[PDB]
């Protein structure tokens, strides 16, 4: 509802990423991540289910 939604800007995972660090989340194509950060051009900071981490800026689609 609109709670959960307020204020966030939303990402569609164009390609499965699997983690190569800690701090790096595990994503499959179509899954929707909420964007935290994107200021680097190759990694953003993204939450999803409880986590919140990276995931390069190649596999991520800004929803808008």
Do not use: C, H
């Amino acid at each position: 509802g609109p709670m959960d939604e307020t204020g966030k800007e939303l990402l569609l995972v164009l390609y499965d990423y699997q983690e190569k660090s800690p701090r790096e989340v595990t994503v499959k194509k179509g899954d929707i991540l909420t964007l935290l950060n994107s200021t680097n051009k190759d990694w953003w900071k993204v939450e999803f289910n409880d986590r919140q981490g990276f995931v390069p800026a190649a596999y991520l689609k800004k929803l808008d």
